[PDB]
Write a protein that binds this ligand. Structure first.
Ligand SMILES: O=C(O)C1=C[C@@H](OP(=O)(O)O)[C@@H](O)[C@H](O)C1
Ligand SMILES: O=C(O)C[NH2+]CP(=O)(O)O
Length: 445
């Protein structure tokens, strides 16, 4: 069922910790490793529930996955080698695994069924099912193009040129993965850049995939279908979204000095850091380097006084999953923090705009929720914030609502309670232990 947790004011967070692996890259490591020819070896994999579900889906289609020591070793089936799954592919809470896998196997000439939990089952799949219909996939979905969904690919899929209508890396990725088993050239046009793990990793696995960027920023990504993919050695960098929790906690809790090691610094993932620096955050980027083909660095974070800023709609894609924690940081900043271009938040694990606004109000924060925006006015000393009565923030099965408000409780005058901590393990099973090690006091029911 549900397991509430309460965060209490901290006298200071301090230490050096390695953050768990990046979820996006981890999902793709299991997918590409499972599809490629030969062996793939992965170090640093995030072992949260979302990623484990993608792994089980790949095994269901023929890939052999095992963990030897600290390395996940995968024996892939080779491009075009996926086998028809016996039962529905259960993605639990993970749309990344669900949506990318719909593109990956939907173009195969067999039936595949997709299911998930109460949260995933309410999320929109039309954004990926429409391009798949264009490629010739037959779709059976619940009203509104929601799960459960059953796909049946054509004998010969049709390659398309698809302009992604919203800033979704998952839609871009689903079309590219469908292209892997489609003869001809699949093209995805992305008017606004989104995380590029699919492009980078597929190139690393040997795909004839190219990215061309116009001076106006529009990206044209071309993929030649049915080409060989070769298993690779993958070193997964630290998750920058997970990093956000101890990083923001250290900025807000007085007397803090926290260093997070091996953090992914791809700029499509660092909008929150840039925003916090604009707010006056003391975040030092240490030893920027190349590791596993990605940009990484260690981040030293110290207590800072913050001032509200206006965050432009075009930075949104580079920090879309960090709006919840940014809203909590804004609750302690001087003045108003204004964030627009937030329509995508309404279709995540929870409607995040509604969940964040409601959670902030329950904890005494002055904020204004708009259809696609949020304004937060802060109280730097934290006085009057939190909830003395112990009322619980509704998490709506969303791991980041749970984590963001638990961080808030380490700073506010009154404790902050979340109605459920059980979904935190979908992306950051180490959260409680990691925060406790730094000094945070979080009581699980
Ligand atoms: O492709 C990916 O790895 C992801 C893309 C994003 O979703 P959208 O494509 O829906 O924006 C992000 O929020 C999710 O956690 C992972
Ligand atoms: O991790 C996040 O904050 C949002 N996306 C989760 P997914 O789309 O994979 O379910």
């Amino acid at each position: 069922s549900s397991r509430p947790a309460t965060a209490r004011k901290s006298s200071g967070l301090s230490g050096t910790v390695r953050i768990p692996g990046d979820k996006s890259i981890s999902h793709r490591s299991f997918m590409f490793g499972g599809l490629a020819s030969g062996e793939t070896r992965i170090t640093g994999l995030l072992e949260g529930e979302d990623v484990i579900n993608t792994g089980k889906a790949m095994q269901a289609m023929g890939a052999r996955i095992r963990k030897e020591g600290d390395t996940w070793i995968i024996d892939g089936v080779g491009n075009g080698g996926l086998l028809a799954p016996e039962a529905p592919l259960d993605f639990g809470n993970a749309a990344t695994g669900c949506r990318l896998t719909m593109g990956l196997v939907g173009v195969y000439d067999f039936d595949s069924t997709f299911i998930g939990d109460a949260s995933l089952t309410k999320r929109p799949m039309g954004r990926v099912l429409n391009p798949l219909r264009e490629m010739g996939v037959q779709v059976k979905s619940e009203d509104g193009d929601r799960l459960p969904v059953t796909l049946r690919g054509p004998k010969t899929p049709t390659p398309i040129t698809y302009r992604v209508p919203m800033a979704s890396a998952q839609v871009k990725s689903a079309v590219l993965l469908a292209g892997l088993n489609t003869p001809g050239i699949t093209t995805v046009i992305e008017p606004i850049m989104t995380r590029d793990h699919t492009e980078k990793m597929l190139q690393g696995f040997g795909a004839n995939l190219t990215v061309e960027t116009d001076a106006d920023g529009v990206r044209t990504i071309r993929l030649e279908g049915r080409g060989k993919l070769t298993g690779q050695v993958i070193d997964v960098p630290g998750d920058p979204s997970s990093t956000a929790f101890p990083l923001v906690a250290a900025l807000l809790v007085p007397g803090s000095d926290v260093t997070i090691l091996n953090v992914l610094m791809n700029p499509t993932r660092t909008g929150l850091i840039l925003t916090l620096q604009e707010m006056g955050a003391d975040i030092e980027v240490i030893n920027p380097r190349l590791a596993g083909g990605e940009d990484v660095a260690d981040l030293r974070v110290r207590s800072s006084t913050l001032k509200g800023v206006t965050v432009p709609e075009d930075r949104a894609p580079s920090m879309i999953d960090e709006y919840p924690i940014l809203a909590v940081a804004a609750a302690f900043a001087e003045g108003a923090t204004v964030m627009n271009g937030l329509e995508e938040l309404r279709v995540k694990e929870s409607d995040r705009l509604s969940a964040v606004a409601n959670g902030l109000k329950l904890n005494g924060v002055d904020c204004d929720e708009g259809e696609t925006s949020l304004v937060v006015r802060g109280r730097p000393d934290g006085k009057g914030l939190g909830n003395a009565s112990g009322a619980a923030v509704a998490t709506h099965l969303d791991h980041r609502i749970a984590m963001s408000f638990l961080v808030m409780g380490l700073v506010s005058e009154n404790p902050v309670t979340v109605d459920d901590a059980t979904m935190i393990a979908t992306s950051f099973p180490e959260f409680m232990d990691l925060m406790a090690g730094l000094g945070a006091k979080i009581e699980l029911s």
